[PDB]
Each structure stands twice: as C-alpha cells, then as structure tokens.
C-alpha cells in the first residue's frame, strides 16, 4: 500500500510542478479552487475506494508523513489544500486527518511555517469532528502548545498563533462543537490550580475558566472551611470531614475553578480535632488510616509537631504558680494522643523530634520543656524495649537545646506530681543508657552533668529496702527504671502489694461468708497520671496476672477492694487499650469464665457496671454477647450471678448510643443469635426499646416505610423467636412507623385474664390438698409448667399469712433462671388482683403482703419486680393499675424511700476521687442488708431452714443503684400513658435525687425529650418537672454553670400563672454563644472543664451541644417557634452576634437544630420559601455577569433582601452539612411539593441550584434514590422557568451545571425522563443541552 501511495502522491506533486511552471494553458474556465483540487486527488480517490476501513488510519498517517517531509512551504500548502478538499467532499474523515496532523513527530514549533499551515488546516476541518473527538484533539493541541518556550522570536508569533485560533474555535460556545464542560475539564487537567496559562493562549483560556466560576459556586458549600464538627467516636463517620492523607485537601468532584480555600490543606480542621479528647478514631477515618502499612503520614506527623509547638507557646505567658489552665491540660492531652499514632506507626518519633528541633530552634523562650520531655518519655520508656536505638537518639539534640548545661538542676519537690515531669529528662537518659548497656559497645551514652543530682537521687532511692506511698518517690522509680530487668521489681512490686493485701488479716463483704483482702485504699488518679504508660502497662499486667492466679487457685477469698478499684482506673487510659480494655474482654473475661471462678467473674462484671465510662461500642457488644452466652449455659443457676449478668446486660443495652446501634448490630445479621437473649424477655424488650429511640434520634426510617431490607428485620424477627411478646398500644404508638408495622403483624396470642385467675385458684387448691412433700416439690417446680408459684406464695400468705417449709424448697428447686417467668406471670396476676378488688382493707392487705414478699420474705427484689411490671402489655385501665402497683411499691412503704434518702445524702458519684468508698459502701449494707437467697422466707418458715450459701463479692452495687436503670424505663412508660401523669411527679419528688449517681444524666434527658416531643409539647410542667429533677440532683456535685444557662435559671425556675416565660432573641444568642465559644476554645470558658475520662461526654463541645439541646427542649415553647428563633440569631441583624464571624455561629446553629426533633429543624423549609418569594429573586431587573453576591454571604450587598438571601443560603448549607441522611431525604419532596410550583424566574432557579447542588455527592453515596429525584426536579424547574420567562440570561451557567451533574452523578440514569423535558424547552436551551441525552 505504502509503495502505491508513494507512486500516487508523486504524481500529485509532479503534476503540480508542471502546472506551476506553465500556467494559463488549460485553465480557460476552471472552478473557483475546487475542481482543480478534486481532480488532483482523482487517482487517490480510486485508490481510497479499494481499501478497507482497517487501512484508513495507516493511509492517512502515511500521507501526513509525506506532506510533513516536504521542504517547500508552497508545496506543503498545496498538498494541505488537496487534503482540505478531500475532507470537505467527504472522502477523508476529519478526525483521522486532524489526529494524524497533530500527532505527527515532524510537527514541531521550530518548523515555523509547517506549524501555521497545519493548524490553519485543522481550523478548517475540525468542525466536522464529533464532540468526543474534539475533546481528544483539545488535549493534544494544548500539549503541543505547551512545548513552546516562554521566550521566542518576534517574527514567528503570528505563525505560532494559528494554533491559538483552533483553541479559540473549540472553546467557542456559539460554535457548540462540544460541551463546554469537556473543554474546561481538559484545560484544568493540564493547567491545574496554581499554573499560569501559556503565553500563546493567555486571556483566551483564563476567561473561559472563569465562565465555570459560577458552576463551582453552585457545587460548593458556603463557608465549608470554617464548618467544624463535634467529635463523636460513635457511628461511622460523615464523608464531609474526610481529607486527602497526602495533601489534607477535600476530595473535589470535577476539575472546576473552585475557591482558593478549597484547594488548601485543612490544617485548622485537623488541628481542632486532634485537640479534642477521644478524637483518635475520627482522625484515622478522615485520613483513611485503617492500619494497612507503616503509614508515616507526614501531614499528620507535621501537624502533631505543630500541636506540640503550640503547647510550648502557651507554656509561656503567665499560667502562674498553681496549675496550668489549658497548657498543662493540652500537655496532658498530647501525652495520651501522640502515643497512638507513633505506636501503630503513623507518626515517626525520630522524624518528629528532629522536625521539632527545627521548629523550636531559635523560637524564643522555653518554659514547657519538662512537659515536652514528659510527652517524649512516654514514647521512649514504652517502645525502646524493641525499637532500634538510633530512633531515639535525636532526643539528645532536643536536650542540648532546651536545658542549661553549666550548673546542676536541683531535685524538685517530690511531694508534687510535677516531679515526674521534672525528672522526665533524667528518666529519658536512664532508658537511653540502659539500651546502651544492653548489647554494649559501638555507642555508649553518658549522663549529662546537669542531670547528675536527679540521677543520684534515683539511685540512692533505689537501694532503699522499704519505700512508702507518702510521696512520688515510688512513681519516679517506676518511670525511670521501667525497662530494667531486676531494677523494676523493686519499685513495681512496692505499689502492687499495697493494693493486693497479701496478709495483715482480711475484711468482710456484703452478705454471709464472703471475705476479701485487707487493702481498701486504691492508688489515686494523680499518682496514676504521674506514671508513664510503660510503668502503667506492667501494673496492668501484674494485676491481671494475680487475678488469673487467684482464679486458678480455686480460692474463695475475694480480691482486695483497692485492687478492683485501681484496675478500673487503669482501664481508663486508652493508650493502654491493648493490654487493658481489649484484654479484659477477650482474655481475662474468658479465662476467668473457663476456670469457673464465679466469685471473681462477679467482681469483673460489677466493676464494669459501676466503674467503666468511655468504652467503645464494639467492646460493649463483645461483653454483651459474652453475657448472653454466660446466662444461657454454664449452669450459672445462682441467684447472685443471674442477677449480676442480667443487670449488667441491661446497662449495656440501655446505654448504647443512638448512632452506635446500627453499625455494631449490622455486623451480626449473619447470625443474630450471638447478640440476643434466649430466655430473658426483658432484655430483648429493652433492646427493642433501644432500637426504637436509636432509629428515631438518627432519623433512620425517615423515607422508608418498611422495616424489610434493613438490618432491623433480622434482629427483631429473631427476637420474636426465643422471647415472643406483644407491645401495649401506648408504647407501640411511639415507635417509628416501620417498627409498628412489624409488631402489628408478628402478633402473639396472650393468655386471658380469666384463665390466669382460674389456673392460680386450681393450683392453690391442689397445694392445700397435697401432703407428700416429694409430690409437691416435683409438681410445683416442674420445668415447662405454668409459672404460678409466686402467685401461690401470694395466695398462701394472703389467707394463712405464712408459708410452709415446702414453700422454700420449691423456690430452691426452680432456680434463679427459671424464676423470672414466675415473676413475669406474677406481674400479670398482680394486675388482675388490683384491677378486680374492693377498696379499703381488702386493697391495703394486697399492698402489705406485696411489700412483704419483697422486704420481709425476700422472694423477689424490688428492681426485678418493677422491671417486669414495666415490661408488660396491659392496655387502658389495666395499664394504669400496673403502673399504680409500681408507684405503690416505690412510695407507699418506708423500705425504699429510706434506702434512697440515706444513700444519696451520704455518698458521692465521683468514685475516681474517693479513697473511702468501701467504708461508705459497707455502712449502707450494714444498715440495709440485702438478702439474695430467700433468707427472710427461710428464717420465718415453720422449721427454720438454715441457709449458709456463700455470697459473691459485692464492691459497689446495691438496690438503689440497680433500680436506676429500671427507673429510666419506668419514667418512659408513665410518659406514654396520659392518665398516669400525676403519679410521675411524685416519683421525681421523692426518688428524683437518685439521679446523682446516674452515669449519663444529660444524655438520658436528651433522648427522653427528643423521643417524647409529641407527648411533652402540651405538658410543659411535666417536662420541667423531669429536667429540673434530674439536673437538680447534681447541683452539689458539679460546678455552677455546667448545664442550664444563667438566664434559664433566673426565669424558667418559677411557678406558672397563665404566662410562660417566652425567651427573647438575647436568650438564644447567649445560649448559642456558649457553643461557639466552646468550639473556639476559650481560656475562661462558658462551661467549667471536667475530667472527660469520667464524664458521659468525651469533650467540651459534645457536652456543650447536648446541654443546649436539652435546655431548648425544656422550654415551654413549641418547636416551630424555637427553631425560628434559632434561625433569627443569624438571619436577622442582631447585636452580641458579631459579623465577620458569622460562619462559626451558622455552624453552631446547624449542629444544635439538626439534633433537635423535626418540629425544630423543619422551619428551614419555611425560611427558604420566604427568600424564594423575595424581591431579590422575583424581580426582573437584569445584571451583567453572574449575581455572585446573591449567593455569597461574604460579599457586600446593595439591599437587605440580598443580605438575607445570601445568609439564608449559607445557613441552609450549614444546617444540611450537619444533617443526617434521613433529614436530607425530605429535600426531593421539598423541591417537588413546595418549591417546584413557585419557582418561575431565572434567579429562583439558580438559588435552588445553589441550595441543593453542593449536597448532590452525599445523595450519591448515602441514598441514591434521592439523587435521581433531585435531578429530574432541576429539569422540571428549568422547563417552568423557560416557559414563564421571555428570555434567559444565564443559560450557560445553568447548562454547565447540568452537564457537571450528568458526568459526575446522574450519568445515564435519568435520560428518558430528562429527554422528554428537553423536548419542550426553547431551541436555545436544546442546542446547549445537545449532548445531555448521550
């Protein structure tokens, strides 16, 4: 072929050479430069016909190579002219010709005339190339233009500019060769953010990029860089906060000219999070640090270094003699924070140290050097065991930089905990010195001269044969000599024996025949905080070893109270999560369980219930599954062990966070039997109730009307097996819709009221007619028979007022596990008895004996009986009677009110600050002994059955604390039943003070008010009675100003008089101001700082958010009025709310209102419509250029209408930025059922795009159905605007955005729905949207 082409195109050249040399011969009337060129390629036309399409590209590549091989520009132009006519006449495809002309390696910018002639030819024929091929040629042409240097000759510019005209032709919107979005995509790929356009192009491509500046705004969240989250390490993570681990930049969709701040690293965002306690999990999720390899993330590594420098800066400037007030608080946080990232190999200690040296070299004074070395000592002392020595040597350069070398550094006052920070430098050197002695030679490390006094003090104290706890001399030795074989048994063993109590007599525990070791004083927190992580690691390991040792020794002596108290305090440090928390549930718990210790196992579960705090959700689910398998088998048929297992599980289930429930239980859909109960109906009901509020608070079902398909169907369907039950109407009506639809079907028949009464009387008649004890015991304790014995005991002491000796033996044979069914049926029987009863003595006799069965005979505990009563399915008056029985049991006798009054008055819930809990614990049990083995029954029986069952260790719990989780459930049942309103007020008056010892009081109020907004909106006094009683129980245990605002304490704390307190705008500004200042970090601070390791919240912002939501829900003001008042804090000109910082306020309002019930945050839809109908969007006064200031809240505005229009868009973005996907699912219907019929102008259409546009990506990832509904709504609005407007001025930004939505999101999903909408648009819109249907 190529030889044929050679002969053909040689004739073309040879024929033109003789025509150039002899003109005017055969040109009498030729065609105007058409037939000549066509006839020249006549031989090539016949040759091209006999070629397959496979040979076409090879033939054109050869022709281009033959034209580019010519030397005469006059001949190249002629051949190009022949080629141009071949494309015009349809003989040659334009794309292949353009591709071959531009890809030619002979085409160089130095070939100054071939360059111009080539691109002049491209300019003629490129118009006939399809839009995808034009995009391909756009890339290579811009690449060839990039090969031209910045300095060239002046004479060749006009010839080089021939390529600029092709770029000008491709970028011509009126030419419409390709979607303009394609063109700006290829331009930004070669000229990204930061690069300057080539001099040959210049203003051409720079102005074309600026035409997509509006589209980038439509797809950007206003003020996103200043939007900050509240750190909750709970359910998954929002994709809005994820960052590029290599650049710290947001992942942006498309190559658009987004604002400059969106291309910058989000240091302020990452810095704010790292400063917060328990941000460890959220920092990993942002940067994708899911533990894959030695990450060595330098942007995180450098940000940790900047956070250390910031702690050094705040170390200066006052802070005075006592404490730090921040600074020492930040160093404390830096201590535990940086350990994780270096331990799991995300930050490198040697690189951090030398990078810290450069940052600290010549940067002013150095006052926080000891705290810096204390932070660094945590890395060295804990990891130098096996890491190479060369990784810790850079510390030597830091020491020489921060300390005075000449004179001795004196020994500090070892009575203060700050001595461990002063000795931290010498401790670091002792670890470096021992790493240099172990495996000697090469490089020995000498101690400095300035640290000679600190070292002599540590060695002279190490040879002291008996060291005390009266100072920190012991902690200094544990910190310094932790990595020494025999030099660590001297200090470590000195503080392990002080809590073990090996000798010096024993001590009793509650009940009978239960003894523990002598020591009761645990190691204080300021001592444990003074220990290094390595020193605490050995303490954790030595305590767990002795427990396992005591567990295998089959010993009946209990662990010392100081041991379990100290071990619970060491379980606080999450930097020791490997040996502490993970080992407690995965190693110590199974080991104790496999050894049949029971006693020790009872201590570990009791320690968990009363001494844990910030446990990760997956760890709680692990313990929960262990509790279920522990209760079902292993024959744990002991009264005290079954009560402990069932009580501990109730706390885990009830305390699960709303956002934590789905991600932890969605993992067990394959086999939900592991995380459920097989016989405890109450626990399974408690889990259903916890699903109810978790799906409610997270708005999980908002949008879906069926539980099927979700994770809840397999959890609930399995719960119907094992423990089938019904739900009363007043409780079922509060569940989310799809949950009710699951319980209306899957309905269980219930034994009627008459059949229970008839069964109890027939069995009590049999009891009075039988004499053989063996027949009585076999019958009334038969497994599988109706559980009526508690009803029988009720019948016995109701008539005869006493119980036979067989009555105790029958209970003893039933067992603790099988007895809950008897309590369950006895609860129903109690309801029938009280519901069908005459008043007077006949009713007061039932109350008298019902208390006797609890307190006199000890047949069932108060919390076991009331939990069963509150977990019944009675309706109407029967339910009123059931709750009336609960009120009687609690308030009528003196047995429980005295226990609660004395326990609250004499005890404090801060166990971590207490050194005498066991004493105050024994004083209660010695005053109100609890009988857990039917002692009262066996003691007052006809021949007193002597009982000697040994009790298991009880270190913390009692009946008052065991009832507090059930009290949470009792309150919810009373709120659901309207006639039982008044009795709930009496409970909170008498027993409300018990919430002093609640573990999550603010969280409980938050869920209660949020879940029961419908039942408390029109009962404000009850809502105030609840909030004031629970928060009021902590007034003497938490600082003033910790929860309720100063205004709420001065106005909403008075009696009602047909004039509730209606807060003004000043109130809501101050209330929101407490959150904006807490998230900003203030040295005084709106709230007092608490040890977040022992609080229900992880950090100040999490605490500031919930107490604000709780207070707003406690107001006697509707959700609509409160929600609008929140929006008016920013959307109306308000003092005390300073502008220039309005995004921090919009961020807080978004966080606050998105956590409130729907009647609160729904008002945003009303506020948008008021802007949609505003004169700024409804007027027809035209602009020149895009009205950026109508949508940019930072620009200057000409009208108040423009100001509120932009502020509304900015606030609507902040609100939707923090909204759950369930709350965002209302937007498609909000667009189609509210905005669609009123959006008629072009500015209204753009305002809708600016509203929803930025959140398209969230619908792409989280709920796809909405993304399509929104996409069609945008086109439906475009057709309405197109039909109501005579003309449209901004059709290019509208179509650019619609193209961006296609290629980035909708793709080809919406094609037929959109195409029919396109066909009714005006032709100007159709030509721009020519490629949308492709």
């Amino acid at each position, epitope marked *: 072929m190529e030889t044929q082409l050679q002969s053909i195109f040689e004739e073309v050249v040879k024929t033109e050479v003789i025509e150039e040399a002899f003109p005017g011969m055969f040109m009498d009337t030729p065609e105007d430069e058409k037939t000549k060129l066509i006839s020249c390629l006549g031989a090539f036309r016949q040759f091209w016909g006999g070629l397959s399409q496979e040979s076409h590209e090879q033939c054109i590549q050869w022709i281009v190579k033959f034209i580019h091989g010519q030397h005469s520009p006059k001949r190249i132009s002629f051949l190009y002219d022949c080629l141009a006519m071949a494309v015009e006449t349809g003989l040659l495809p334009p794309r292949l010709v353009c591709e071959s002309l531009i890809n030619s390696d002979t085409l160089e910018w130095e070939r100054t005339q071939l360059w111009a002639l080539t691109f002049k030819l491209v300019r003629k024929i490129i118009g006939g190339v399809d839009y995808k091929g034009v995009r391909d040629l756009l890339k290579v042409i811009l690449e060839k233009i990039l090969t031209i240097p910045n300095t060239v000759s002046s004479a060749v510019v006009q010839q080089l500019l021939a390529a600029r005209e092709v770029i000008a032709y491709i970028l011509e919107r009126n030419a419409c060769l390709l979607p303009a979005y394609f063109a700006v995509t290829e331009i930004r790929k070669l000229y990204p953010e930061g690069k300057l356009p080539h001099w040959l192009l210049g203003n051409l491509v720079s102005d074309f990029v600026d035409t997509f500046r509006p589209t980038a705004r439509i797809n950007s969240i206003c003020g996103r860089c200043s939007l900050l989250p509240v750190v909750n390490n709970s359910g998954a993570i929002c994709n809005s906060w994820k960052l590029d681990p290599a650049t710290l930049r947001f992942p942006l969709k498309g190559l658009l000219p987004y604002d400059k701040d969106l291309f910058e690293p989000q240091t302020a965002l990452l810095r704010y999070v790292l400063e917060q306690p328990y941000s460890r999990d959220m920092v990993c999720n942002m940067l994708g640090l899911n533990k894959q390899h030695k990450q060595r993330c330098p942007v995180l590594e450098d940000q940790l270094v900047d956070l250390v420098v910031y702690a050094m800066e705040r170390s200066e400037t006052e802070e005075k003699f006592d404490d730090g007030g921040t600074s020492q608080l930040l160093w404390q946080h830096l201590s535990s924070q940086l350990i994780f990232f270096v331990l799991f190999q995300f930050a490198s200690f040697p690189h951090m140290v030398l990078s810290l040296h450069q940052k600290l070299a010549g940067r002013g004074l150095i006052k926080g050097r000891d705290h810096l070395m204390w932070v660094l000592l945590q890395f060295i002392s804990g990891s130098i065991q096996k890491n190479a020595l060369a990784d810790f040597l850079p510390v030597m350069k830091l020491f020489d930089l921060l300390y005075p070398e000449k004179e001795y550094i004196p020994v500090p006052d070892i009575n203060k905990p700050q001595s461990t920070h002063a000795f931290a430098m010498t401790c670091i050197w002792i670890h470096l010195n021992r790493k240099a002695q172990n495996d000697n030679s090469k490089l020995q490390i000498p101690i400095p001269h300035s640290l000679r006094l600190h070292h002599e003090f540590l060695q002279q104290s190490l040879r002291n044969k008996s060291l005390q706890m009266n100072d920190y001399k012991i902690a200094l030795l544990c910190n310094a000599y932790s990595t020494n074989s025999e030099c660590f048994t001297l200090p470590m063993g000195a503080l392990v024996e002080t809590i073990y109590g090996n000798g010096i007599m024993r001590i009793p525990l509650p009940g009978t025949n239960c003894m523990a070791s002598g020591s009761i004083t645990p190691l204080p927190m300021n001592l444990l905080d003074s220990l290094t992580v390595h020193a605490k690691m050995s303490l954790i390991h030595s305590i767990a070893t002795r427990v396992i040792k005591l567990a295998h020794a089959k010993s009946s002596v209990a662990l010392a109270p100081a041991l379990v108290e100290t071990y619970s305090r060491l379980l606080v440090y999450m930097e020791i999560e490997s040996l502490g928390i993970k080992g407690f549930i995965s190693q110590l718990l199974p080991t104790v369980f496999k050894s049949h210790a029971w006693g020790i196992l009872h201590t570990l579960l009791e320690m968990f219930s009363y001494r844990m705090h910030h446990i990760q959700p997956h760890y709680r689910v692990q313990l929960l599954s262990h509790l279920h398998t522990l209760a079902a088998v292993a024959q744990t048929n002991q009264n005290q062990l079954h009560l402990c297992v069932e009580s501990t599980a109730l706390r885990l289930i009830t305390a699960l966070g709303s956002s934590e429930v789905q991600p932890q239980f969605t993992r067990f859909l394959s086999d939900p039997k592991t995380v459920l109960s097989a016989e405890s109906e109450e626990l399974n009901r408690a889990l259903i109730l916890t699903l109810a509020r978790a799906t409610h608070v997270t708005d999980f079902f*908002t949008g879906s*009307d069926s539980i099927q398909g979700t994770w809840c169907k397999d959890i609930l369907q399995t719960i119907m097996s094992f423990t089938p039950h019904n739900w009363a109407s007043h409780t079922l009506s509060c569940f989310p*819709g799809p949950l009710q639809a699951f319980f209306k079907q899957n309905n269980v028949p219930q034994e009627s009221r008459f059949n229970l009464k008839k069964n109890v009387e027939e069995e009590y008649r049999k009891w009075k007619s039988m004499s053989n004890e063996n027949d009585i015991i076999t019958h009334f304790s038969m497994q599988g028979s109706p559980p009526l014995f508690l009803c029988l005991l009720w019948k016995m002491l109701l008539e005869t007022d006493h119980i036979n000796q067989i009555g105790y033996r029958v209970l003893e044979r039933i067992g603790a596990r099988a007895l809950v069914a008897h309590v369950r049926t006895f609860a129903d029987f109690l309801v029938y008895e009280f519901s069908t009863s005459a008043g007077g003595q006949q009713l007061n006799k039932c109350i008298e004996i019902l208390n006797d069965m609890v307190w006199k005979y000890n047949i069932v505990t108060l919390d076991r009986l009331i939990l069963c009563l509150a977990m019944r399915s009675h309706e109407g008056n029967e339910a009123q009677v059931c709750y009336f029985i609960i009120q009687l049991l609690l308030l009528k006798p003196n047995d429980f009110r005295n226990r609660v009054s004395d326990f609250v008055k004499e005890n404090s819930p801060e166990h971590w600050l207490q050194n005498d809990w066991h004493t105050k614990h024994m004083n209660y049990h010695k005053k109100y002994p609890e009988k857990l083995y039917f002692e009262g029954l066996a003691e007052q029986v006809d021949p007193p059955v002597q009982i000697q069952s040994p009790y298991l260790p009880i270190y913390f719990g009692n009946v008052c604390l065991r009832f507090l989780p059930v009290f949470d459930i009792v309150i919810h049942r009373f709120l659901e039943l309207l006639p039982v309103s008044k009795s709930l007020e009496t409970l909170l008056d008498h027993l409300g003070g018990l919430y002093k010892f609640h573990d999550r009081p603010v969280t409980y109020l938050y869920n209660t008010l949020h879940y029961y907004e*419908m039942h408390l*909106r*029109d009962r404000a006094f009850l809502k105030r009675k609840l909030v004031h009683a629970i928060i009021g129980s902590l007034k003497d245990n938490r600082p003033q100003g910790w929860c309720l605002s100063d205004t709420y304490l001065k106005c909403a704390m008075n009696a009602r008089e047909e004039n509730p307190w209606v807060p003004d705008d000043t109130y809501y500004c101050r209330l929101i101001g407490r959150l904006v200042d807490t998230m900003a970090g203030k040295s005084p601070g709106p709230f007092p700082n608490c040890d977040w390791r022992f609080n229900e919240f992880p950090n100040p912002a999490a605490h500031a958010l919930h107490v604000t939501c709780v207070e707003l829900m406690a107001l006697a003001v*509707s*959700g*609509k*009025e409160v929600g609008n008042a929140l929006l008016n804090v920013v959307l109306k000109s308000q003092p005390l709310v300073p502008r220039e910082n309005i995004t921090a306020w919009m961020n807080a309002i978004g966080l606050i209102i998105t956590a409130l019930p*729907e*009647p609160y945050w*729904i*008002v945003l*839809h*009303d506020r948008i*419509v*008021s802007v949609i109908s505003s004169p700024s969007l409804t007027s027809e006064t035209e602009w020149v250029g895009y009205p950026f200031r109508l949508f940019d809240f930072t620009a200057c505005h000409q009208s108040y209408s423009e100001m509120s229009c932009s502020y509304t868009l900015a606030l609507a973005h902040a609100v939707w930025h923090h909204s759950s996907i369930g709350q965002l699912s*209302l937007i498609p*219907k*909000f667009l189609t*059922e*509210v905005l669609l*019929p*009123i959006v008629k102008t072009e500015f209204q259409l753009l305002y809708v795009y600016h509203l929803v546009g930025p959140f398209l990506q969230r619908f792409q990832q989280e709920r796809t159905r909405c993304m399509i509904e929104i996409g069609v709504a945008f086109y439906d609005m475009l057709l309405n605007v197109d039909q109501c407007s005579t003309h449209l001025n901004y059709m290019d930004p509208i179509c650019d955005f619609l193209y961006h939505m296609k290629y980035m999101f909708t793709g080809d999903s919406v094609k037929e729905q959109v195409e029919k909408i396109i066909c009714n648009l005006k032709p100007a819109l159709k030509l721009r949207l020519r490629f949308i249907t492709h």
Partner: nanobody
Amino acid sequence: QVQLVESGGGLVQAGASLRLSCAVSGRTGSIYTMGWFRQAPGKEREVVARTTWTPGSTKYADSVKGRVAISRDIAKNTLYLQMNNLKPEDTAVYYCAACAYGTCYYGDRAYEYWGQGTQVTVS
C-alpha cells in the same frame, strides 16, 4: 394544646359546591402543617388536602385532584376547603387536623390535633 372546630357542611346536591371552614384556636404557632380528612360510614379515614401553614404550599389527594382547593387565613385563624363538582362518593364526615411535623405533610405521619368533624352528604 390546639382546638379545631369544623363548620360548613350539610346536605348538598350532586355537582354543586361547598366551602368548609375550620376555626383554629389555642396555641397556634405550634402548627407547621394543617389538612382536611374524610371518613365514609364504613371505611377508613382518608386524606383530602394538606397545607404547610406559613408558606401556604398545597398538596391534594388523587381522589379530589382538580375539584378541591385548600387555603388558609393566618389573621383570622381559619382553614378553608373549597369542594367543587361534588359527587355522591364524597359523602363522609370531614375533619380538619393540625400537626407540627413536616413529615405529616410530605409523608403520611398521623396528624396530632383534630376536630370533631362535620357531615357532608351529597345526594
């Protein structure tokens, strides 16, 4: 607490019109959406028309689509239901209901406050 009192029903011939009114009283401002419902003698209560209170966005059921207009007067605290071209199948007791949730309007959440109703019998 929010009280509602329907009014304006009675016996009307087929094809004629009727203008129901609802006297909204009590704690107005707690109301985000309001609607009209109806219930035949032996059938389940259906929804007729719903409105968002302050903006006035309307939403109509497919059974009465095109024949019915729902409106409100915030100043007079009154909800209106204009029913035109009445058919015999429209014989029912008509209730006005309010609700504080947007999902009452968008979805099918039950309304919270109710009136006793008014009889509309179209022969």
